Design a protein around this ligand. Structure first.
Ligand SMILES: [Zn+2]
Ligand SMILES: [Zn+2]
Lengths: 51, 343, 65, 46, 103
């Protein structure tokens, strides 16, 4: 689901993923840290640019 | 001259680079030659005044002009300790299976404020652990955590898996004693914040207890303190020895608080002036600039005290100040009656 | 173990502002702006909320249940 | 008199009498805690 | 049993008196010290704490002439009571007019 959200849009909200997937905060954080970085006022951005 | 220095010593408190000067109250008869500092009730009633600048729920700010540091500190200490309120003292536990310790649980419950009006109750006599209708209140807390019968297959979050897993203070139910139900309308006797997290539970664990609350003062224990932060500060009055203009004036706006020093273009050039010395916190950053040290004179007004009283929500802070003044009056009356009984 | 109800220095009610703070951590708010939005002006409550470690869930993971 | 205990992993109420091998049904764990008392206990919030 | 008087020595001199006040602290001590120091007939006024464990204070009053040093005590108490009444009335009036002008 996280990878699909990243394919649909470059910016992914952590709270929306936590609400949809019904998972705890630490699991969503580990999922995002593997492929995203925290950008202030924008959420989570994919670590690599569009190739 | 000498008169100006005497007036500055007797009216202002100057803050130097290394230390504060003129901090002691000196307006007393015999200390000054050209001043008759003898007590005068008429002059005190004339000069004294109270001006409230901000007043909302659980927050008050008011300036008192004409009072001294001794009476101000007395009021502050009475508000901090000598104002009686209602707080949890006795905890009767029935099969506490929580991970949180029983003593720690009782200590956390004791710190929870109670919205009950303390003036309508009395101090419990020595002993008498059973308690009476007049001088005690009972709060029942019974929370049984169990698994949610309807939840998702994964349910990683504890909110979906379990119910009542976080025992908030809203679960506390006031149990009337005698005729307290008729005297107090429903909804008056309750926890103040209603959102304080007492403990966290798991399925199988249960927390069952009764809480006996009695009247008490903050001096005995800090849990009876009604005010969260009740303090007072001297009103600052920043003065400019020489007119400061140009870009250095902007430095003034960056040296003091952003809201005290304002720059204006009277003739197309920026000149700084004191707009609202109240907002300044006296960070003493002007001493870093070498040139701007001898151009300003930071000072505090001796007979102008801004009181800020943020309460815990038991009662509005104006009633708190009134009750503090009443407690001081009661102490004075008790000592006068004792002296009269002696003579 | 758990968030204290009262602040050690001043005594402001801080236990009720813990989980909401966690929500501000679940949101995009940083530490400073979240502590400012919670209404903690003095630094004592900021230290109380920031330096607190949530060990209650780690213990409940070892609870009998 | 029914004496009740709690297992260390099943956490089920097991009734065993005196001089019994400490065990628990539907498992094999051998750590048996005692349930909390029913007597009233008074605590001070100090 | 709360406030007790003590003379300076066995001679029972009314010029130097010590009032021992029970269940008190620095608040009332400092307030009464400030309220009675302004009395021109008081040479020496001073309050102290015997020990932080026990809740009691000792005030000492030494007058100028032949004052019994008990009359300045009652004078300071009455002046402090009047000041408290005045500040209470002023604060109540201020709060009331603030509530009126706010709405
Ligand atoms: Zn604090
Ligand atoms: Zn078992």
């Amino acid at each position: 689901f996280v990878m699909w959200k990243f394919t649909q849009s470059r910016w992914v909200v952590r709270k929306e993923v936590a609400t949809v997937t019904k998972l705890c905060a630490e699991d969503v954080k580990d999922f995002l840290e593997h492929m995203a970085v925290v950008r202030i006022n924008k959420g989570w951005e994919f670590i690599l640019p569009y190739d | 001259a000498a008169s100006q220095a005497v007036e500055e010593m007797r009216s202002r408190v100057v803050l130097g680079e290394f230390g504060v000067r003129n901090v002691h109250t000196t307006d007393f008869p015999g200390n000054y030659s050209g001043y008759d500092d003898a007590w005068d009730q008429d002059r005190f009633e004339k000069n004294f005044r109270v001006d409230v600048v901000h007043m909302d729920e659980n927050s008050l700010e008011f300036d008192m002009v004409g009072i001294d540091a001794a009476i101000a500190n007395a009021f502050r200490r009475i508000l901090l300790a000598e104002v009686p309120t209602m707080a949890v003292e006795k905890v009767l536990v029935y099969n506490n299976t929580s991970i949180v310790q029983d003593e720690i649980l009782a200590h956390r419950l004791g710190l929870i404020p109670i919205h009950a009006d303390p003036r309508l109750f009395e101090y419990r006599n020595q002993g008498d652990e059973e308690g009476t209708e007049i001088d005690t209140l009972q709060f029942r807390l019974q929370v049984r955590c169990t698994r949610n019968p309807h939840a998702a297959k994964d349910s990683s979050d504890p909110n979906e898996l379990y119910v009542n897993h976080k025992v908030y203070t809203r679960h506390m139910t006031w149990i009337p004693l005698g005729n307290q139900a008729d005297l107090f309308p429903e909804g008056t006797i309750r926890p103040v914040h209603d959102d304080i997290l007492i403990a966290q539970l798991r399925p199988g664990q249960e927390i069952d207890l009764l809480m006996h609350c009695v009247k008490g003062i903050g001096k005995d224990h800090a849990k009876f303190s009604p005010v969260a932060t009740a303090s007072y500060r001297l009103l600052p009055d920043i003065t400019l020895l020489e007119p400061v203009e140009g870009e250095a004036a902007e430095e003034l706006s960056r040296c003091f608080s952003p809201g005290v020093i304002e720059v204006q273009e009277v003739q197309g050039k920026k000149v700084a002036r004191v707009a609202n010395p109240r907002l300044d916190t006296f960070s003493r950053e002007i001493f870093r600039n070498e040139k701007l040290k001898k151009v300003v004179r930071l000072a505090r007004v001796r007979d102008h005290y801004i009181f800020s009283v943020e309460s815990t929500g038991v009662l509005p802070p104006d009633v708190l100040v009134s009750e503090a003044i009443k407690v001081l009056m009661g102490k004075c009356r008790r000592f006068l009656d004792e002296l009269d009984a002696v003579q | 173990m758990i968030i204290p109800v009262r602040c050690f220095t001043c005594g402001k009610i801080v236990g009720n502002k813990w989980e909401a703070y966690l929500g501000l951590l679940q949101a995009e708010y940083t530490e400073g702006d979240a502590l400012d939005a919670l209404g903690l002006k003095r630094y004592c409550c900021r230290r109380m909320l920031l330096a607190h470690v949530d060990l209650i869930e780690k213990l409940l993971n070892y609870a009998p249940l | 008199q029914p004496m009740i205990y709690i297992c260390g992993e099943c956490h089920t109420e097991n009734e065993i009498k005196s001089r019994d091998p400490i065990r628990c049904r539907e498992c094999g764990y051998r750590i048996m805690y005692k349930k909390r008392t029913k007597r009233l206990v008074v605590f001070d919030a100090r | 049993k709360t406030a007790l008087e003590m003379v300076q020595a066995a001679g029972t001199d009314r010029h130097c008196v010590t009032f021992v006040l029970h269940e008190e602290d620095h608040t009332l001590g400092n307030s009464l010290r400030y309220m009675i120091m302004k009395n021109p007939e008081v040479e020496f006024c001073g309050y102290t704490t015997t020990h932080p464990s026990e809740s009691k204070i000792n005030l000492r009053i030494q007058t100028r002439g032949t004052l019994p040093a008990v009359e300045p005590f009652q004078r300071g108490l009455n002046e402090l009571m009047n000041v408290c009444q005045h500040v209470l009335d002023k604060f109540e009036a201020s709060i009331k007019d603030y509530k009126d002008q706010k709405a």
